[PDB]
Design a binder for this molecule. Structure first.
Ligand code: CLA
Ligand code: CLA
Ligand code: CLA
Ligand code: CLA
Ligand code: CLA
Ligand code: CLA
Ligand code: CLA
Ligand code: CLA
Ligand code: LUT
Ligand code: BCR
Ligand code: PQN
Lengths: 26, 731, 84, 80, 171, 63, 152
């Protein structure tokens, strides 16, 4: 339960940092 | 073309400077491309709904975790001997001794001990079960949504308001006073008499039975008839058990004053009465200014009419109405100023007059909350003094403000600044002087030669409040006067009982040690104000730079010409004041915490003697309370204070890192990077990869910021780690 | 007793209508109502309100009624509450 | 790029030009002062914004003013 | 010397305005009106507080303690009456046409016609002020004295009793 | 020949000058109508740039 | 003023005894007749003397056993602040007035800054004593103690 979510709270930075990187270099 | 889209001049920067500055200017709407007054106002109005959405979501989560991972129910049944739980801990890096030490409060796993005081707050208002907490979380989640819905709604053309609508101040005041302040206070008094008070006494009044349960034996009649004393006939007994129908009266509105003896908190009946009382002033007051019905005032005209003849204020406040309403920086600086003042008023009144049950005994929570709000109040004050200069530079019209009170400040600015300098220089020369002097003799082993000025003026105030200590014979503690007898029982007997309590923080005993520190704080206030107003009054220009008006609030400098012009912008003056602000609040929080942890240990004697000289502070306060903290993790063991020991060192590291950006400056780093740019180009297997943004050293202003951020973060985190651990360890 | 209410509400209405009516109106003329810019209503399309203000009576609008009376009730409750 | 302006309060001492290392300024025939010259800022594109020109100006407050605006490679002083 | 505006022709004008309070004309006329009224209430009152004391009533202070604890012998009753009436008169007196009737309403207020006279009306004025200023001063004297809570008259009696008692004061 | 004498003391009215409300001695005053700012002025105190003189506009008071 | 005077103090009295015993502990290793001996004993009499004097002059002494000064203005304790304060302002003004008087005399003619770094002008003609009567600067105030250049 609570051992599934803090990692998606770390999948999210991976996703966010990747998307933002594409946004800022465009 | 690129980020930032709101700034084309920024977006065409070939260097890494664009990414940084694109972030630091996102909320500065007035500097954005093709900005209009219309776009400005409903960007803020929409950003306003966004902030509300965050607050409600943030508060929803708090109600959620406490209901899901916090005992609360276990806490309710024995508020004295159980530790509140903030939330559970889940960290893969945790070793087994870690999971061990952090398992507390009767939890199945490692949790964090809440020091926000949400347990006492929620319990006092009438929350008794986890189910109640969930319904609140759902309701806040729903409130968080409709805030976004409204934000989206008014961004739509068919619902967007005109700027003039925003500038109708007369009606926004009338509603905010009468509705936002008055009604909400009135509605709260309803929750108190329907749920909080009966929930306190012992009955569970909720949505499925609140309709059928009288808040008072007698009907709603007595209110409408006129005789309202009937709401105070049967108050709660002094020996009353909270959450127990023992010695519980019937009255829903009183003025008893003092504290509920078991909880050490203010009476709920006093509060239900308080909000009801203040609601009216707000309600009537919100009907002062004119709207659409033909009666009311005009703010402008009142400002116009206030001109003292025969000088000496000039045109008084004429045209001042339009200067404020057309400038939202003035409004914000005016708002932060007022909010900042009462933010401290919260801190001062919430440790002296605890509002929630069983909060006074939670010493770690009491220290945290005070220290919390004082730093919050601190930063807010620096913001009120920051939007001040911005008003002068960006929105100030000298001609439209010809010879009025505002324009008279700039024409004798050298007077205000110099006397602030004097007052600061005066306080500093002696407060430091008296301290150092006292340390000398204790070094020389002669503490009887000290200068220990008795705060006799303040002690005169204390006796004037009801304290029978000292021989002063003043009001509320004297032999014949209109003041005390005006008590007419009611508040006085319950309150005079509370002031001469040697346990509570309600008017502590003060002496020579309290004298020196109060001057230190006075020194901190004056100096900080000196820096901030000097930045404001010289924002439009000085003699070293008469056209500073033409460069904006924040610019690096004006060059090395004319002797040198480093840190000459009004922004930098703010940035310099943030340092002094941290120092001031630092002295305030040091003074509050030390005097309390000595009181809580039943040893105020140590404070009264060690606070008169600075070595006492560093040793008996700093050194002495660090032992349990710095042994959070030992080369032998590992405690529950290991988090704070790590954060303590963490705070030191961030703090010292800021020093780099504050001492070392750009030209060194830029030349260093240029060598690294050459390197990357001439290194095989790495040539294939190239950067899309030119590597450059951080800007002159950026570094001052970045350095200040590090300095401030480490400042807070270090003391936070110490404030909690040292207090939690001993309790 | 309800009587206290009416007597005070009663006097107030009497005062506003006869005794203090001229002064009130006099101040309002020299005062309202909003500025910008100038005059409000130009933008912020709100904006009187002429009808309710309209009173076939030799003077006193309805608003006045609500306005004068309210003060009266407050006083009445003020006194009524106070004795107890 | 950077924004530079010249003011009629100038006296044509030509020191702002000699100070510039990128050649952003130059002298101009004018009837306003005894020198009958005046500074000019034609090549603002090559301006780095170092304000060397300002530290050579003898006029009570500067006749030449540099207003740091949008950044470019030339203004950033980059050689890479 | 003498201030520029204080001519001397004015009733009761002796050249006193050290803070230049009446330098502005339209408010000097405002203050002059304010003076008599303060003067008129006061003159009426001092006798009010002395004779009753003379008959015997524990001074004006104790005179007022009755409310604290026919016809309308109740504080509520009297208050409304004092209220509504003192309101009727006044905020009617406002007229603000010819300096509150030149500050001297006359007419029905001069049933015996002392206003008709030319020079007597003016000498009557200067007399009225001076007496009035005298009261105002007395009232203050009474207030300061009564602030100890005994008697305006009895005070006289006490000093009269002996010139030995001494005020000292701060002093 | 124009407004200010050769040895007359003069008060500055520029607002942007180091000597904004101060006084100063005049060196001379060129007579070319073309000249925007003649009226050269000496000062006892230098400014942040170590110059003691500056040329001013015709608008100033004397003393 | 919960403090009870240094005379009827048990703490302030105890503090005296504590300090002299420690000093006495030190002379035991030097043998009387020796130098470090008097120096210790001379320190002890000064200790007794200062404790003795403080009780004489009043001085209230808190619970901690140390004298607390009262600056309320109380006539009983004027010597604790007001009288030394009056003495300070006297000298403080005197210095202020003499210094001001100097820079004024220098300004006309000469190279004024020459006199500031070097003052081979001592008290000028005779400027120091002028401070003996500085307070008469109140009369300088009614005339031209201030320049009228900026504001009033
Ligand atoms: C009601 C509150 C309020 C509002 C609505 C505003 C609004 C505004 N402010 Mg103001 N300000 C406020 C309060 C407020 N302020 C207070 C209380 C202070 C005192 C510090 C200031 C000090 C201040 C300054 C000095 C400036 C403004 C500026 C501005 C304008 C642009 C800000 C911007 O987008 O840059 C972007 C903001 C950011 C990118 C913030 C990120 C950086 C901070 C340090 C992050 C927080 C710290 C850190 C990340 C914490 C991490 C720690 C971690 C280890 C846990 C905007 C109108 C600027 C302005 O007016 O332009 C001329 C400006 O220079 N404000
Ligand atoms: C390097 C060692 C290390 C690491 C990697 C961690 C990692 C973590 N700790 Mg542990 N901890 C450590 C050392 C460490 N800790 C030590 C030595 C101690 C003392 C013994 C502790 C004591 C401790 C406690 C008591 C707790 C943790 C918790 C956590 C978890 C945080 C939950 C979370 O991610 O929510 C989200 C992450 C954040 C909110 C961090 C945001 C802060 C950033 C920097 C500022 C905001 C960035 C901004 C938005 C910019 C946007 C960019 C972005 C979108 C990419 C995380 C797994 C907590 C936990 O278990 O979670 C339930 C918990 O309560 N730690
Ligand atoms: C009854 C009518 C009414 C009401 C209830 C409101 C209410 C509000 N308006 Mg609106 N407004 C109105 C009419 C009204 N307005 C009219 C007629 C106009 C113009 C024609 C406007 C134009 C307007 C604008 C332009 C804005 C608002 C905004 C707001 C919000 C203010 C921000 C906030 O939430 O803090 C509310 C503060 C409180 C509820 C308490 C007052 C503050 C005290 C000092 C706090 C202390 C209380 C207590 C001691 C502490 C308790 C703490 C404890 C509970 C933990 C608030 C919801 C702003 C917004 O959009 O929201 C973000 C804003 O931008 N209004
Ligand atoms: C404590 C604060 C602090 C720190 C950490 C540094 C660090 C550094 N300085 Mg600095 N300096 C400081 C204060 C500090 N300085 C002050 C106050 C001054 C004024 C004199 C200077 C003046 C100065 C000069 C003149 C120079 C430096 C240089 C350097 C760098 C040397 C190279 C290096 O060791 O890289 C390694 C980095 C570290 C050892 C920092 C800690 C690394 C952490 C522990 C590991 C990473 C953590 C983790 C992965 C982050 C991910 C977490 C995620 C959430 C983000 C290094 C970054 C030099 C330089 O430029 O490099 C040659 C240099 O020329 N400094
Ligand atoms: C909303 C507008 C409003 C209006 C028009 C009224 C009107 C009235 N209320 Mg009412 N009231 C209101 C709101 C209002 N109320 C509210 C909001 C509350 C509580 C929330 C009350 C509570 C209330 C109570 C308890 C009573 C009234 C009563 C009355 C009557 C008073 C007698 C009178 O007119 O004086 C006289 C009018 C004159 C012209 C007299 C002339 C003047 C001479 C000198 C007398 C009158 C019909 C009283 C009544 O008798 O109820 C039937 C009564 O006791 N009201
Ligand atoms: C003999 C005629 C006479 C002369 C030559 C003066 C002269 C003076 N008077 Mg005086 N005065 C006088 C009569 C006179 N007064 C009378 C008759 C009264 C009562 C009506 C006063 C009440 C009075 C007051 C309150 C003051 C003076 C003051 C003064 C001095 C300030 C100027 C002024 O007119 O007043 C000046 C020396 C003032 C002063 O500065 O005295 C030196 C001031 O304090 N006078
Ligand atoms: C000694 C005090 C005193 C003096 C000298 C005056 C004098 C004057 N009054 Mg005034 N008045 C006074 C006290 C005084 N009043 C008091 C205490 C009140 C409040 C009741 C008033 C209320 C009042 C009104 C309403 C009016 C005057 C008016 C006048 C003027 C014409 C009437 C008149 O002279 O009769 C003076 C007769 C005596 C002083 C007799 C004294 C009693 C003995 C024992 C008989 C005249 C200048 C009239 C005026 O100026 O209108 C044009 C005006 O209408 N008075
Ligand atoms: C109408 C004017 C007036 C009169 C007739 C009196 C009379 C008296 N006063 Mg009062 N007094 C007055 C005004 C007056 N006072 C004012 C305005 C104050 C406020 C400062 C005081 C404060 C005061 C105190 C504290 C005391 C008296 C006391 C007394 C009584 C004798 C002792 C004494 O006077 O000490 C001297 C007091 C003063 C000199 C105050 C100045 C009053 C002025 C100068 C007197 C009126 C001026 C005028 C020219 C008088 C000429 C006489 C004529 C008016 C009849 C005596 C009945 C004493 C008492 O209680 O005895 C039992 C008492 O100790 N008075
Ligand atoms: C106008 C007219 C006209 C018409 O037609 C007709 C007729 C009616 C006639 C008329 C008139 C009327 C009148 C006259 C009125 C008046 C009043 C007065 C004057 C009073 C007194 C007034 C005045 C006064 C009181 C004065 C007073 C005095 C005093 C106080 C003093 C006192 C005292 C004493 C003893 C002592 C004590 O220890 C204290 C004191 C206190 C100090
Ligand atoms: C009594 C007392 C007290 C109090 C005090 C006070 C509170 C006061 C005050 C005060 C004040 C509030 C003052 C003021 C002022 C002002 C001004 C305006 C100034 C001036 C000045 C000057 C001008 C000077 C000059 C000079 C001289 C003469 C000397 C030298 C210097 C010179 C040269 C600088 C206490 C109780 C504390 C203590 C005890 C005693
Ligand atoms: C070190 C240093 C640099 C070099 C600093 C650089 C190049 C900053 C680059 C930092 C790297 C990219 C790592 C920083 C990572 C941060 C945690 C950023 C997180 C991402 C977002 C939160 C923004 C300067 O340019 C400078 C300029 C003026 C005065 C002092 C200094 C100075 O001290």
């Amino acid at each position: 339960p609570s051992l599934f979510v803090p990692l998606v709270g770390l999948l999210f930075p991976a996703v966010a940092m990747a998307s933002l990187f594409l946004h800022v270099e465009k | 073309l690129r980020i930032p889209r709101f700034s084309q001049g920024l977006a065409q920067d070939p260097t890494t400077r664009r990414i940084w500055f694109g972030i630091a200017t996102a909320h500065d709407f007035e500097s954005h491309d093709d900005i209009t007054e219309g776009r400005l106002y409903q960007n803020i109005f929409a950003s306003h709904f966004g902030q509300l959405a965050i607050i409600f979501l943030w508060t929803s989560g708090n109600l959620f975790h406490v209901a899901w991972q916090g005992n609360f129910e276990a806490w309710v049944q024995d508020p004295f001997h159980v530790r509140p739980i903030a939330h559970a801990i889940w960290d893969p890096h945790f070793g087994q001794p870690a999971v061990e030490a952090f398992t507390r409060g009767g939890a199945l796993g490692p949790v964090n001990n809440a020091y926000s005081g949400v347990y006492q707050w929620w319990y006092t208002i009438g929350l008794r079960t986890n189910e109640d907490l969930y319904t609140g979380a759902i309701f806040l989640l729903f409130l968080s949504f409709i805030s976004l819905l409204a934000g989206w709604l008014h961004l739509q053309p068919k619902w967007k308001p005109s700027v003039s609508w925003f500038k109708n101040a007369e009606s926004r005041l009338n509603h905010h006073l009468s509705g936002l302040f008055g009604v909400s206070s009135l509605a709260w008094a309803g929750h108190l008499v329907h749920v909080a008070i009966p929930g306190s006494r012992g009955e569970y009044v909720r949505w499925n039975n609140f309709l059928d349960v009288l808040p008072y034996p007698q009907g709603l009649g007595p209110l409408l008839t006129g005789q309202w004393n009937l709401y105070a006939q049967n108050p709660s007994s002094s020996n009353h058990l909270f959450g127990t129908t023992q010695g519980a009266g019937t009255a829903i509105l009183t003025i008893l004053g003092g504290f509920h003896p078991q909880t050490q908190s203010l009476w709920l009946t006093d509060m239900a009465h308080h909000h009801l009382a203040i609601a009216f002033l707000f309600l009537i007051g919100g009907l002062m200014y004119r709207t659409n019905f033909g009666i009311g005032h005009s703010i402008k005209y009142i400002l116009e009419a206030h001109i003292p003849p025969g000088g000496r204020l000039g045109r008084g406040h004429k045209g001042l109405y339009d200067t404020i309403n057309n400038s939202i920086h003035f409004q914000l600086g005016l708002a932060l100023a007022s909010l900042g003042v009462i933010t401290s008023l919260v801190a001062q009144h919430m440790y002296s007059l605890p509002a929630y049950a069983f909060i006074a005994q939670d010493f770690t929570t009491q220290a945290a909350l005070y220290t919390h709000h004082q730093y919050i109040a601190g930063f807010i004050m620096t913001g009120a003094f920051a939007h001040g200069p911005i008003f002068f530079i960006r929105d100030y019209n000298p001609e439209q403000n010809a010879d009025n009170v505002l324009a008279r400040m700039l024409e004798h600015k050298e007077a205000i600044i110099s006397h602030l300098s004097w007052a600061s220089l005066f306080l500093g020369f002696h407060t430091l002087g008296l301290y150092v002097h006292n340390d000398v003799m204790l070094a020389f082993g002669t503490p009887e030669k000290q200068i220990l000025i008795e705060p006799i003026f303040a002690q005169w105030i204390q006796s004037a409040h009801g304290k029978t200590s000292y021989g002063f014979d003043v009001l509320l503690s004297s032999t014949n006067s209109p003041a005390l007898n005006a008590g007419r029982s009611i508040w006085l007997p319950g309150w005079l009982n509370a002031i001469n309590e040697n346990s509570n923080s309600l008017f502590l005993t003060i002496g020579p040690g309290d004298f020196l520190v109060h001057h230190a704080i006075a020194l901190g206030l004056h100096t900080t104000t000196l820096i901030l107003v000097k930045g404001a009054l010289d924002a439009r220009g000085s003699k070293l730079m008469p056209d500073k008006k033409d460069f904006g609030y924040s610019f690096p400098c004006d060059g090395p010409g004319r002797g040198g012009t480093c840190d000459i912008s009004a922004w930098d003056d703010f940035y310099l004041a943030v340092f002094w602000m941290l120092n001031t609040i630092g002295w305030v929080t040091f003074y509050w915490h030390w005097k309390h942890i000595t009181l809580w240990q039943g040893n105020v004697s140590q404070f009264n003697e060690s606070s008169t000289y600075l070595m006492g502070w560093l040793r008996d306060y700093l050194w002495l309370n660090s032992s349990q903290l710095i042994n959070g993790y030992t080369p032998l063991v590992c405690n529950s204070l290991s988090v704070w020991a790590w954060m303590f060192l963490f705070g030191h590291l961030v703090w010292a890192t800021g020093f780099m950006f504050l001492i070392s400056w750009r030209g060194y780093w830029q030349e260093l990077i240029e060598t690294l740019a050459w390197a990357h180009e001439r290194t095989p297997l790495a040539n294939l990869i190239r950067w899309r943004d030119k590597p450059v050293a951080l800007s002159i202003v950026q570094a001052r910021l970045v350095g200040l951020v590090h300095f401030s973060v480490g400042y807070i985190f270090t003391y936070a780690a110490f404030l909690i651990a040292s207090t939690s360890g001993k309790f | 007793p309800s009587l206290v209410i009416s007597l005070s509400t009663g006097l107030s209405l009497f005062l506003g209508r006869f005794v203090f009516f001229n002064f009130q109106r006099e101040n309002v003329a020299k005062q309202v109502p909003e500025q910008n810019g100038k005059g409000t209503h130009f933008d912020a399309g709100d904006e009187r309100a002429k009808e309710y203000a309209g009173l076939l009576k030799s003077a006193a609008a309805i608003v006045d009624v609500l306005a004068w009376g309210s003060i009266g009730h407050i006083v009445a409750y003020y006194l009524a509450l106070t004795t107890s | 790029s950077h924004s530079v302006k010249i003011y009629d309060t100038c006296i044509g001492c030509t020191q702002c030009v000699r100070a510039c290392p990128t050649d952003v300024l130059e002298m101009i025939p004018w009837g306003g002062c005894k020198a009958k010259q005046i500074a000019s800022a034609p090549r603002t594109e090559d301006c780095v914004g170092c304000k060397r020109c300002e530290s050579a100006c003898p006029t009570d407050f500067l006749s030449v003013r540099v207003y740091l605006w949008h950044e470019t490679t030339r203004s950033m002083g980059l050689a890479y | 010397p003498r201030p520029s505006y204080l001519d001397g022709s004015a009733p009761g004008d002796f050249g006193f305005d050290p803070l230049r309070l009446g330098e502005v004309p339209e408010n000097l006329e405002r203050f002059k009106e304010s003076e008599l009224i303060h003067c008129r209430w006061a003159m009426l009152a001092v006798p009010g507080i002395l004779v009753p004391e003379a008959l015997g009533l524990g001074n004006w202070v104790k005179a007022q303690e009755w409310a604290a604890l026919v016809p309308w012998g109740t504080l509520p009753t009297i208050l409304v009456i004092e209220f509504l009436s003192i309101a009727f008169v006044e905020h009617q007196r406002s007229m603000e046409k010819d300096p509150e009737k030149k500050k001297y309403p006359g007419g029905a207020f001069d049933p015996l016609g002392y206003s008709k006279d030319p020079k007597k009306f003016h000498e009557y004025k200067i007399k009225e002020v001076k007496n009035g200023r005298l009261a105002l001063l007395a009232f203050v004297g009474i207030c300061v004295q009564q602030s100890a809570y005994p008697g305006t008259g009895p005070l006289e009696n006490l000093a009269t009793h002996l010139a030995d008692p001494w005020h000292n004061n701060i002093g | 020949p124009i407004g200010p004498k050769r040895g007359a003391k003069v008060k500055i009215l520029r607002q942007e000058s180091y000597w904004y409300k101060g006084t100063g001695s005049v060196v001379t005053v060129d007579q070319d109508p073309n000249t925007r700012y003649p009226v050269v002025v000496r000062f006892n105190k230098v400014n942040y740039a170590n110059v003691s003189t500056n040329n001013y506009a015709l608008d100033e008071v004397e003393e | 003023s919960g403090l009870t005077p240094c005379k009827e103090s048990k703490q302030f009295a105890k503090r005296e005894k504590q300090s002299i015993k420690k000093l006495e502990s030190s002379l035991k290793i030097y043998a009387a007749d020796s130098a470090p001996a008097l120096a210790i004993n001379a320190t002890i009499e000064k200790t007794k003397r200062r404790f003795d004097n403080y009780a004489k002059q009043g001085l209230l002494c808190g619970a901690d056993g140390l004298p607390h000064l009262i600056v309320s203005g109380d006539q009983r304790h004027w010597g604790e602040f007001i009288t030394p304060g009056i003495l300070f302002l006297y000298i403080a003004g005197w210095i202020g007035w003499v210094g001001r008087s100097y820079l004024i005399a220098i300004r006309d003619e000469k190279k004024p800054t020459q006199k500031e770094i070097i003052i081979d002008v001592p008290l000028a003609s005779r400027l120091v004593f002028r401070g003996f009567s500085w307070p008469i600067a109140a009369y300088r105030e009614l005339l031209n103690g201030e320049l009228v250049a900026k504001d009033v």
